[PDB]
């Protein structure tokens, strides 16, 4: 829900004043979007271990998790290994028993996405859709009808 | 000639090959929707299917996900071409396919669609290319920095020489619908400020409530609203918060509708706000020249506006490295030709066969459409080894 | 020497001018093979 | 590099057994060296300022950079970073009938950022022309705005 | 939710729509203008790429037999076959530079035996190079395969 | 606690950067033992209690 | 080298200070290293001449 200004100093900035005391570092950058999505990049020296350049980062971040909302805390925070690009991209479609671009995205992320991402050193997986959820669309006229709020 | 055939021969790092897999990205203007950009990704799907059956095996487009970032403005169609055997000529190979693609998306379209190559490499090392960045070193804001970045993009394309190609990254700068809640108006009628904020948050933008179990697996439960009660500014007043005195109160009571200019992508570099400047070295000049005639354009900017280079490079290859490499490569070659020889004279025979095999190496590279990249640089070092070989025989058998 | 000091890599072009060595193993194994063996086989069997 | 980490993942199995007064306060696992080396004094000669203004500018421009740079263990400020400080009068609290609990509540309400959604939302109606991000409450900025809390 | 005076029960369905839909509608993919989802796997920053892509199929293969009717896998954007072309067109070029050398060795010396010594003197050296790069850290790289031809 | 020793309330933004907001008291109402009785807590029955 | 890069950040910060703000250097290790090379590599050369 949050806009670009909101995430820029309710999550982003807090992490940045707690992104210190780390071994090896060239620079830090950041992106803060109007979709309510932030992602920082800590680049390191060439030939450095990716296994330890992690860890420290997510233990420094984590000294700053309780300075944040909950809207964000219980939402997925994730420190991962990066490689600006994809390689294998596995499309998933239907031919016979026809179904929707919504039913398919759920079944991909409720059977195979959990397996793939853990398998043979995957950095991070990106869904091309979304996993299912018990979605509710509140009517504001029928809320005032019985005297009620969200 | 050996010199002139080398200085004028321009420097690359690595060639952009046919990988059997390229792609093409989309981007719409200030505050477009999912329905707008889907029309564009649809028109793109035609060029590759109907007007390119022979070369494209399949497409895979996506609505609202650019490689800049995210949102309903963006898009991307991954491409997977047919096998290499069935694509015969240069026409039917990545370079030419993305060429007439870019023409067609700049012809019968009305937004920003491209197509591009798939280097290999990573994102960096375009060669004759750079990435500047512009920092808020003092206590300025977004509004003040915006103007400073406008002034560096201006002066760049205002005295080029030997021109250039400058542009920002993705700070398009669109409007934003602010809601001012007067606190005195709220408490008067008897409404909690907590209740008001989670009515505005759990209706328009959603709210993570709880976890449930669908079909064995645990997923999430979200709460929002039907689309038809949150698409315009006038629909805010349809939401009636409840007051402590058991009577309904609309938003129109305590709210204040008004537009405002902000940014949908706030970038920050190294603990401070920043904006990206993706420029490209001139077609005449190249990098070391272009970058140093960009630093004097950033020091001419106003107070509290510094700079720093992301993220280009850390000292290159045919740049300042190549020297140092060759340099030592000589001082050893000559030594070892003395550890088996003794003179001095014997090495200096071998130590100027170097330019014999080199003037030819350059001739073929400079002649055809190739360039001094990595593969060519080691084609050279191979040949000082093959010239030493041949010569050393002339010198070994004869002595 | 034409090869391995040139294979003292500088940054993002690490395994690029570095990976000679690949080359050099081949040079020193062509030396080995030529100092051993090629001598042998020639003597072993020619005309 | 590994003698760390384990320590701050063991500590962190004990963070939710603590107060909040402490949790949202700075917990920090770092590398030690009983001693300093470089100590950079910071003073004023011309445009004169106070031992308070200087400590803020040191920790709002350079301290964040230094500590992350070239493997710094931990930095110690010789002062403090600025903060919106409030000195409650107990006579003027009883004057209007009030406590420090009512002042605290007023700042965790008016001094707060909210994640209001956006027009032309995530699942819209097919045919909408615009999509903009809603703003609501913004975090306060200056001494004057904290003086006008209700 | 409520029980209005007269014993009438207000339910969650009576005030709101309830469908099992995605938790994020912000993105929706098409594959040849067909409704679809998938998995865009990204590398793990120091991983063994092509073996990681071979094991992407490892999980995916055990998943195949338990799909509903219609669900079928497809492969757009994929790196795999470029590696298969760079070995099969280099180890082919390898063999072309032996057959070709064989002819130059015959045109100068009609001795069949003399055009045999050098034909075995390089396959063996090639192999020894594999064993040094195995015992140093490197791989069968695009670079270190062109180094076997040069 | 929020008078004599301070209390971490919330975060605000001064001049671009995010810092902290603290709540305590003027020094002159917390320097001696006799100054404790000047603090009047409120009771549920809307009347002050020292 | 860590102390050489303490100045690396500090040097980029110098040009954007307000009026009056100037850096000073008390307690500092750096020059002790510069004395232990320049008085040892000097002693080195004295033990050759001698
Ligand atoms: C007359 C034919 N016109 C060309 C026009 C071009 O326009 C470009 C516009 C851009 N718009 C701003 C978003 C960006 C980012 C990259 C471009 C590249 C480019 C793309 C991939 C790899 C390297 C380069 C490249 O040229 O790199 C270094 C120069 C480019 C290349 C050629 C031949
Ligand atoms: C029968 C003669 N025995 C040998 C026995 C060896 O035992 C080793 C044990 C170790 N103990 C665990 C701490 C580690 C780390 C490296 C070793 C290497 C090694 C050392 C330097 C560079 C490369 C290698 C090396 O062999 O690299 C790739 C194979 C090694 C090499 C040879 C010849």
UniProtKB/Swiss-Prot annotation, chain B:
Q: Which residues lie on this side of the membrane: Cytoplasmic?
A: 338-347
Gene Ontology cellular component terms for the protein in this record: efflux pump complex; membrane; periplasmic side of plasma membrane; plasma membrane
Q: Which residues cross the membrane?
A: 321-337, 348-367, 374-392
One GO term in the molecular function aspect is:
enterobactin transmembrane transporter activity
Expression induction per the record is: Positively regulated by MarA, Rob and SoxS transcriptional regulators (at protein level).
Free-text disruption phenotype from the record: Loss of susceptibility to contact-dependent growth inhibition (CDI); inhibiting cells still contact the target.
* Keyword Cell inner membrane belongs to the record: yes
Keyword Hydrolase in the entry? The reply is no
Alphabetical keyword list: Cell inner membrane, Cell membrane, Membrane, Transmembrane, Transmembrane helix, Transport
Q: Which family does it belong to?
A: Belongs to the resistance-nodulation-cell division (RND) (TC 2.A.6) family.
The identity of this protein, by name, is Multidrug efflux pump subunit AcrB
Q: What is the lineage of its organism?
A: Bacteria, Pseudomonadati, Pseudomonadota, Gammaproteobacteria, Enterobacterales
UniProtKB/Swiss-Prot annotation, chain D:
What name does UniProt use for this protein?
Answer: Multidrug efflux pump subunit AcrB
Task: Quote the disruption phenotype from the UniProt entry.
Answer: Loss of susceptibility to contact-dependent growth inhibition (CDI); inhibiting cells still contact the target.
What part of the full protein is here?
101 to 250 of 1049
Instruction: Output the superkingdom of the source species.
Output: Bacteria
Q: Describe the family membership recorded for this protein in Swiss-Prot or TrEMBL.
A: Belongs to the resistance-nodulation-cell division (RND) (TC 2.A.6) family.
Question: Gene name?
Answer: acrB
What is the species of this protein? Escherichia coli (strain K12)
Q: What biological function has been recorded for the protein in this entry?
A: AcrA-AcrB-AcrZ-TolC is a drug efflux protein complex with broad substrate specificity that uses the proton motive force to export substrates. (Microbial infection) Involved in contact-dependent growth inhibition (CDI), acts downstream of BamA, the receptor for CDI. Its role in CDI is independent of the AcrA-AcrB-TolC efflux pump complex.
Where is this chain's protein located in or outside the cell? Cell inner membrane
Q: How does it assemble?
A: Homotrimer, with large domains that extend into the periplasm, interacts with AcrA and TolC. AcrA may be required to stably link this protein and TolC. Interacts with AcrZ. Part of the AcrA-AcrB-AcrZ-TolC efflux pump.
Q: What induces it?
A: Positively regulated by MarA, Rob and SoxS transcriptional regulators (at protein level).
């Amino acid at each position: 829900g949050a806009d670009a200004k909101t995430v820029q100093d309710t999550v982003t900035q807090v992490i940045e004043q707690n992104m210190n005391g780390i071994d090896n570092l060239m620079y830090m950058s950041s992106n803060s979007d109007s979709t309510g999505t932030v992602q920082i990049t800590l680049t390191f020296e060439s030939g450095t271990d990716a296994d330890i350049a992690q860890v420290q980062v997510q233990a420094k971040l984590q000294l700053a998790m309780p300075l944040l909302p909950q809207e964000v805390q219980q939402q997925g925070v994730s420190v991962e290994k990066s490689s600006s690009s994809f390689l294998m991209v596995v499309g998933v479609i239907n031919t016979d028993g026809t179904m929707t671009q919504e039913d398919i995205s759920d079944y991909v992320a409720a059977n195979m996405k959990d397996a793939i991402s853990r398998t043979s050193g995957v950095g991070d997986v990106q869904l091309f859709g979304s996993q299912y959820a018990m979605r509710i669309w509140m009517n504001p006229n029928e809320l005032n009808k019985f005297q009620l709020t969200p | 000639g050996m010199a002139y055939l080398f200085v004028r021969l321009p420097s690359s790092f690595l060639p952009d090959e046919d990988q059997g897999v390229f792609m093409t990205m989309v981007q719409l203007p200030a505050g477009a929707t999912q329905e707008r950009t889907q029309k564009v990704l649809n028109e793109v799907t035609h060029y590759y299917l109907t007007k390119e059956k022979n070369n494209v095996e399949s497409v895979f487009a996506v609505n609202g996900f650019g490689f800049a970032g995210r949102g309903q403005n963006t898009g991307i169609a991954f491409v997977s071409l047919k096998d290499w055997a069935d694509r015969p000529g240069e026409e039917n190979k990545v370079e030419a396919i993305t060429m007439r693609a870019t023409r067609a998306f700049s012809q019968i379209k009305d937004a920003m669609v491209f197509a591009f190559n798939l280097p290999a490499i990573v994102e960096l090392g375009t060669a004759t290319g750079f990435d500047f960045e512009l920092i808020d070193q003092a206590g300025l804001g977004h509004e003040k920095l915006t103007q400073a970045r406008n002034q560096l993009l201006a002066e760049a394309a205002k005295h080029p020489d030997m021109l250039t190609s400058v542009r920002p990254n993705g700070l398009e700068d669109t409007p934003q619908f602010k809601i001012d809640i007067d606190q005195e108006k709220a408490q008067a009628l008897g409404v909690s400020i907590n209740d008001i904020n989670t009515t505005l948050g759990a209706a328009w933008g959603g709210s993570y409530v709880n976890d449930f179990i669908d079909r064995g697996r645990v997923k999430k439960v979200y709460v929002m609203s039907e689309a038809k009660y949150r698409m315009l500014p006038d629909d805010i007043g349809d939401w009636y918060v409840r007051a402590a005195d058991g009577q309904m109160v609309p938003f129109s009571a305590f709210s204040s509708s008004r537009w405002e200019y902000g940014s949908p992508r706030l970038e920050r570099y190294n603990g401070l706000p920043s904006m990206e400047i993706l420029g490209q070295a001139a077609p005449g000049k190249s990098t070391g020249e272009a970058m140093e005639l960009m630093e004097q354009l950033a020091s001419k900017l106003p107070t509290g506006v510094g700079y720093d280079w992301t993220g280009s490079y850390q000292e290159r290859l045919s740049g300042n490295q190549a020297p140092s490499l060759y340099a030592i490569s000589l001082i050893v070659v000559f030594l070892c030709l003395a550890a088996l020889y003794e003179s001095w004279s014997i090495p200096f025979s071998v130590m100027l066969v170097v330019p014999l095999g080199v003037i030819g190496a350059l001739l073929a590279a400079t002649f055809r459409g190739l360039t001094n990249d990595v593969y060519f640089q080691v084609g050279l070092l191979t040949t000082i080894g093959l010239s030493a070989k041949n010569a050393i025989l002339i010198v070994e058998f004869a002595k | 020497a034409v090869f391995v000091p040139m294979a003292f890599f500088g940054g993002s072009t690490g395994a690029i001018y570095r990976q000679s060595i690949t080359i050099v193993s081949a040079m020193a194994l062509s030396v080995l093979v030529a100092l051993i063996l090629t001598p042998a086989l020639c003597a072993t069997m020619l005309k | 590099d590994i003698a760390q980490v384990q320590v701050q993942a063991k500590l962190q199995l004990a963070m939710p057994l603590l107060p909040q007064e402490v949790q949202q306060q700075g917990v920090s696992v770092e590398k030690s060296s009983s001693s300093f080396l470089m100590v950079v004094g910071v003073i004023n000669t011309d445009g004169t300022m106070t031992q308070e203004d200087i400590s803020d500018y040191v920790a709002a421009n350079m301290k964040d950079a230094i500590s992350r740079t070239s493997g710094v263990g931990d930095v110690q400020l010789f002062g403090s970073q600025y903060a919106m400080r409030i000195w409650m009068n107990p006579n003027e609290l009883n004057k209007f009938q009030l406590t420090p609990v009512d002042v605290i509540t007023a700042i965790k309400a008016q001094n707060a950022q909210v994640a209001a959604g956006q027009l032309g939302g995530t699942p819209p109606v097919k045919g909408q022309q615009l999509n903009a991000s809603i703003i609501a409450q913004t975090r306060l900025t200056s001494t004057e705005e904290f003086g006008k809390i209700l | 939710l409520k029980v209005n005076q007269d014993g009438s029960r207000v339910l969650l369905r009576d005030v709101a729509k309830i469908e099992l839909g995605g938790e994020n509608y912000d993105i929706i993919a098409e594959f040849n203008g067909q409704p679809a989802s998938g998995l865009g796997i990204k590398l793990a920053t120091g991983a063994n790429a092509l073996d990681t892509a071979a094991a992407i199929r490892a999980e995916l293969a055990k998943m195949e037999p338990f799909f509903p009717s219609g669900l079928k896998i497809v492969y757009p954007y994929d790196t795999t076959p470029f590696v298969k072309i760079s070995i099969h067109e280099v180890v082919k070029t390898l063999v072309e530079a032996i057959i070709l050398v064989f002819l130059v060795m015959y045109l100068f010396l009609q001795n069949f035996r003399a055009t045999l010594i050098p034909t075995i003197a390089v396959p063996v050296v090639l192999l020894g190079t594999f064993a040094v790069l195995a015992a140093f850290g490197f791989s069968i790289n695009t670079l270190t395969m062109f180094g076997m031809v040069l």
